[model samples]
Target chain A: QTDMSRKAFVFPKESDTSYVSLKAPLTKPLKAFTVCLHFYTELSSTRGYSIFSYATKRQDNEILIFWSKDIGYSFTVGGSEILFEVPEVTVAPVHICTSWESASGIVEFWVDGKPRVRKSLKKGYTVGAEASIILGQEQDSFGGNFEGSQSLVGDIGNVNMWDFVLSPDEINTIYLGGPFSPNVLNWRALKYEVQGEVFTKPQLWP
Target chain B: QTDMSRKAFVFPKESDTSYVSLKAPLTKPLKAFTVCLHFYTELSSTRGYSIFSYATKRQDNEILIFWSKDIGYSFTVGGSEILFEVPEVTVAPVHICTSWESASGIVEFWVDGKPRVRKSLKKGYTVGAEASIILGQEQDSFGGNFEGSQSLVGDIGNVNMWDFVLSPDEINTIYLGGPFSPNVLNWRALKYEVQGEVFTKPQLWP
Candidate 1:
């Protein structure tokens, strides 16, 4: 594993696992938020492959998006599951944008700039601010208990998060080779903690 | 109207319409194909917003993806309706990707890398080669009869098409800021004939 502050990160999808953990960026009540990132999948399984997970300040307050072939894609928030299936797209890297608004509990998940599934979930719920954010492994406990079957392999980059929902135009701009400037987190100027054996070495991708 | 070989095109979305017409790039039978582009919508409607339409050799053989609040998104191929609704994403410039595989009759639609819907239709069927491709207006006739209500009013760029299916990885790459190298048609170096009052101008966006 290389240093934490780098361009791309790699998780060597293994029975044993590697993941990156970070101090929670936002530790206040959250009404609206967006998480945007690029992930290259190496494998999929019945066991959920976690992309992002974090424990909220309030107990049992958490959120995550994972891959499960049986049910397609799954989103969990505060113990509630929002599930949807997408076509098998493991052949190349994929860009994902997931956002939630408190006003109507409207949660949107977009792959490659097209809106995939948008459902109303966790309406009027407040996400606890203080928490640990984990990547590559779902946070079973506060930040441990990772299973290998659900580990993420391949590469991930351009991870960003915004405190508010982004407009359709901004989403299009980013989808069409535009830069991302997240209010809460910006990958270009990122600060996070690495746990286990994840590598930050750059990989050549076109 | 401006030069056909330009980077960006803006449709005013008027009853008095503007459209771009071109001879079909591939005049041979297509086993698989992909159409990808970036579009900004100033308006959303129950009436369909036509982006690209083609007159296939097969009578009523057409393919299109359009925005309609009543249905969210409507895709038509070879006279079959493949319909699905996405959350109203009128706030941003949207990236859309639609593809079909004749082998499996699988049609894949994606927005921003998230797979919105995938359904198997017309499996083992072949798409005829000859066509008249039109942009900003749906071809009601072989290549005419564009309705004013279905015209697009916004900026469009990064239009590309491939005579084959692209992997999820390639879709993700372009969505996350990678160059598009199209196999069939490329908007970067486009050859088209403008019809009506559309404007092609360079705009700065980050």
Candidate 2:
């Protein structure tokens, strides 16, 4: 019932049950999307983890952003996926963002406010609206079946999403912690459910 | 008083009495300071115009920012002044900012988000707290004395002043039209008195 704009979801320890549930107010099906978030993790290199998980009755990995140590981050849309190489996040929090469009299939990824080599995936795809979205754990089913091996053990904050691809100015503004309102997921006016050991704490930068 | 965050003061024409009187809630006298604003002017050259006027009982031009078509800008602090060469702003609104500190005597000016050459002025000085602040019209006295010859015939918005020098990131963010709450003068929550033909209107960008 609170706005989590200046706060973070503190995953005290790695566990399959620790996650935040968010209902993305998608007015209808989305043809394009841009998601941005800040995260800090000391989770080891042996395991892959999910930062955002969106699933539906028909699709498990409808729209997911999973990160791995050696291979950087994997962006999944409508069950199809692509990977973007990112530098090793040792200690400091990282601001990561990505935008995907169905018509071009061109996915743009930004790490720590800098754009990376762009790649494409999930052409002519649509993100379904009837879904269950979770944070910090990958959903293997409609809304359950998260594996303990894939878990976030640090902090995640400033999660925002827009139904349409954000322009460079908008993305850069968001990365700089500027005032911007996302039509789909607004962190400042959010309604979410915290499950298991997830705790809400003030963000480090705040 | 209302928040003028997304609004602008529209000076319809050049007039001696057209101005916005602002009461700067200065906690105390300031040793260092930064001031920023966005202005649009189609007024012809030849006559210098005032955009911001802060005058103390002892000095009329205590802290003033004046502009002329030939000379980019003239920043006056403690009655001493320095001129900065700026490109001719024939059209389009320009974002202007400057910071001056008593210790270093350094003055930094930014026009359209780019920092100009550094100059020194008004070292070992303090800006008096008890003063009269005005917009668009120059004050030849503490709280009165306006000249029709020195009037702004354009739009001025996003006027903000900080009691301390802002970092490059903060300046850039503000220049990028990001959300920032200045300590001295917050445009979003401003209390002021409008005089003459000055009109309040929504900003073009908003």
Candidate 3:
């Protein structure tokens, strides 16, 4: 398995959550995988209404994922069901990860990786979409239109998308050092070596 | 009324629906008044959640005035209700604000100069023993704990606490600038000023 240890996604700079899967030499589509969404924030004292998220539409339509109160949260969905979340308007940074298994077709998510969340897709759910993948602050619809109050303001990194589902042990290995073997997806195609410093720290701004 | 122009509260810094408010001071115990929670937020994008707010609690723990979800939602509370929120966990940056009033008998909350939330002793309430006058993030009891995934990352300024409630127009005026007579109860004491500037442009980073 080729290591997909490289760049990450950035958001809040643009309205839409846009990006490419960056992995090529595609002989097959992703069967199963996991995603790790992480980010930083400082919202210790705020009050107001609820905020929710959804999944992406066929054309960048907004999706409601979850409602948040503190600093971070995470959830998962499959290519079968495009899930997403809307935050209660603020300038906080957040990251999301979704990994899957081709067989069971289950997905998992983590906000900061401490309290992880998991969900399963309809049988046979997979990421066969040739569409470009996106991350960071997302819009509710295509052509760029944000949902509610959720906006990102930090850095994101080490975003690795695998073609197969990874076990808990494998996920830990990926977090500590590198993935056992990853299918690199350089969606942005930045100047850095596509396989070297996958993602060390959050970008100044995503 | 001092002409202070600053966002008293900013939420969800990294996504959509962010807002700010201002607080004013009071000369005597508030008896009666009306307020509108006026604030500033980038509403261009309709993404995440809608930020909600209210101002019922005031110094000394009196009648608790409330406002939320854009000035449309509101309510009030009085009597033996606790006027301070306690932190059950050891969250960093202890200076964060709380949704409850302060330890002192005189408490007030403002959103861009409008008294969205109001409270008083005569109206029925008491300041708790462990209450510490916090700023920025609200505590768990007062509809604020900032313990979720989506956090806050912005400036909150122009705080004012009045011994009495100001009219809707007066509150709106404060939103434009600040409360004029500034007594001293609801004074602007501190802020969670982030050290560095947001790297809006990529070139600014290393």
Candidate 4:
């Protein structure tokens, strides 16, 4: 292991009521954004396991990426959703990166450095400036409502969010576990508020 | 994709005789070292895929890591080899990290962020100073005699090496695709000489 020892938030599959919340607000109205993280799981279903979400004042102005057995992975922006059929993985830890650009409404999803899926939506739209970001469960409202059935299971770590759409090389660097300079969230010095039963600093994968 | 449009060297299956040789010598007498990379492949066989090899003057004094369908992955230091039975992966890209410390002769292998295997050997031994590092094909000599059967047939990128064992957090950051400051070798600014049929700046996984 390198000098940096990392930890993950473990969401027990049996427990649907756990999550991690953000202490500081993400620089919002993301005209362009990138979200990269390491996730592992075996559970899959028709219902979504909301990986990350930002709840805006208006219901139609939200952003999220969730996984569903039927639809695979889905991304939503300003209430419009785009689906990318990524197969469920359970063998080992998986690295996922998704980015969206406001100008083109282009969305690209990368799994393990390889670009897995891409779609376009919400062109010229800006994500709301006000948001309550959370992980594990989706936010039905402003960081309050979370359902266990729609909760995530397994471990999640190295969550990095940037204010710009990362390029392929940048994505490759991130996927390679190389150095990254994030604009919104840096996993190394993350400041978050844990909610419910979510466990942080859990034993890393071995 | 930031300002740095990094590229990877792709070795196609059709050209199993190809490889990339480092233009510069690796830092010598590696008392401690770390090698990390991202590899993607659907090709598997009983024959090994020589991913990376450092050849010393002595016939038996060499360091290398290779993958075979039967053995999974094998790492050799000072003619002593430790094998890890990683299941054959064809579904997605895999991130691997291997480190060695001279004092303890301790070797740690990590798949993704999870520590997978550990072994001890070559205690108090220093890897030979004079050697040529090559990718894709194993070197029987300082920098010659590559076997087609031992060639890698897939995408390889994010090659990072250090003169010392990386810390756990550093490994975690690498696993997360965070930024890295490589000591000896940095994939971002790779300088290599290609022999046979090796391609660089190729299309990334999409």
- TM-score of every candidate relative to the true structure: 0.50, 0.50, 0.35, 0.50
lDDT by residue for model 3 (B117-156), tens: 2222222333222222223222234333332222234332
Number of backbone collisions per candidate: 20, 1, 138, 27
The global Cα lDDT (0 to 1) of model 1 is 0.70
Task: Give me the runs in candidate 2 sitting further than 4 Å from their true place.
Answer: A1-206, B44-46
DockQ of each: 0.02, 0.01, 0.02, 0.05
Quote the lDDT for A149 in model 2: 83
How many residue pairs clash in model 3? 138
Docking class of 3: incorrect
**Per-residue lDDT of model 1, residues B60-137, tens digit only:** 437777776566777777877766565445577778888887765666677866664345556677777777787787
lDDT of 3 by residue, A87-180 (tens): 4533334444456565774556544333255566555644443433433334345323543245432235555445666676666665555525
Query: What's the alpha carbon RMSD for model 2?
Result: 16.3
Candidates 2 and 3 compared by DockQ, better number = 3
Order of candidates by lDDT, top first? 2, 4, 1, 3
- TM-score of model number 4: 0.50
- Candidate 2 Cα lDDT to native: 0.82
**lDDT tens digits by residue: candidate 2, A28-84:** 898899999988664535678888889989999998898876888889999888888
Over the stretch B32-115, how does candidate 4's per-residue lDDT look in tens digits?
A: 999998776544533567777888878432778888667688888988887888664545567789998999999998987889
Query: Model 4 chain A: which ten-residue window has the lowest total lDDT?
Result: A1-10
Pairs in steric clash, model 2: B3-B188
The regions of model 4 sitting more than 4 angstroms off are A1-206, B1-5, B25-27, B202-206
Q: Give the C-alpha lDDT of model 3.
A: 0.35
